[PDB]
Ligand binder design. Sequence first.
Ligand code: NA
Ligand code: NA
Lengths: 115, 119, 115, 119
Amino acid sequence: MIRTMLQGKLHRVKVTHADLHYEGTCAIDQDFLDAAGILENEAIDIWNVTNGKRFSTYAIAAERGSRIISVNGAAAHCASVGDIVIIASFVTMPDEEARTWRPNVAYFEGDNEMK
Amino acid sequence: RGSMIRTMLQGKLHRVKVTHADLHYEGTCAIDQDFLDAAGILENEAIDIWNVTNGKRFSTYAIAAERGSRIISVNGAAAHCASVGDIVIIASFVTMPDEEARTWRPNVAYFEGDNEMKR
Amino acid sequence: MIRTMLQGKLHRVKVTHADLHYEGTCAIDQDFLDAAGILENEAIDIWNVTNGKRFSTYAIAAERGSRIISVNGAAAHCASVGDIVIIASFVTMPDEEARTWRPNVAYFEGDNEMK
Amino acid sequence: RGSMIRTMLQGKLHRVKVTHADLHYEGTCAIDQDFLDAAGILENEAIDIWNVTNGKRFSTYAIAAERGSRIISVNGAAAHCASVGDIVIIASFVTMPDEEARTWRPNVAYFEGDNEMKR
Ligand code: NA
Ligand code: NA
């Protein structure tokens, strides 16, 4: 059987931009994507610690070192600048592999400073 | 064998406008076949609809509307989630192994006006 | 690439029972499951035409011919007796097969009379 | 090859009670490893939580809490969706080909009282 497993997680990043009108696509500092194993164009779940909203989208890379978490398009209805969110992706694999799988978790403090 | 499988954006229709929404007398969401083609979306494929106007997010499937009709019809229970005039994003996601995912290019079609696909 | 496709749909069935406390598991007349290709223990989506709620659960079989649609446990917060719902399941398959895939759709009127 | 793949209930914890819920200082949901074993749920597996008390439904993942702790800890953003004392159902779903799905038996564990697993 095939299991759905946490691939990686950005833990407690702060939303830095949220534009309904002008922008549409969610964007995340490429360094953060790299640490969590999350890919450009991959499905992600965003869990908003500030307001409790939970939604699914995909992200593209923001510039390395920018520390950007940009939640745009329709998703701007779900997060505001300054909200603390958790961003996760999930992968599937057979049960035998899933039993030893290790996700990639990156922790943040302050203004999206990775620990 | 046993490769880790990613869920990736296959394609999307960016900022199409809902043209029809009927709760009672229709059920199935329908999208102009030309639009489905541009986004690589199939008839009967699962789609996510993200409503830019009201923020609602939901999952359904679509059938093809007549080519050239420019229809985006959100019917059945989903008519509680969108209305005629609303701007929505319609996406489909596929699964593939990690290596393919890392160079995958989604099929994105951009819209304006009367559901005119931009060049 | 692997596509997620509609497997089958029960179109406009009426909820006949909704018990939060006593029962937990959603149940559907086995004849209806058979017509839609939906399996016992399969993930299903329920889209409530009456109140707009959309949720995911799984169902077990109710007695053949009972015409039961029972929405119980936590899901009783999402539907009431008399609500009209659409129940769907989805399967995955490769793109090449998905292009010709045909879902199983069953239509209903009145008191869960299949057409 | 090309078999149609079903999403099936793998297992569930039926009517466990939330024992801890911390928004700010913790993130990860945790479940007594004995409970994970009984339901066939893995550490880091996607789970659905259906809150019997308040009707909220959400998806997350769990890590193992100490065996015998009887912990059901719903933390991070998910602490907006459950509270200590709430009765919840925790399910995981797996995928498999249609033939296997048709005879698949989910791993269901039933609870009462102080998160006591019924025989
Ligand atoms: Na407009
Ligand atoms: Na109790």
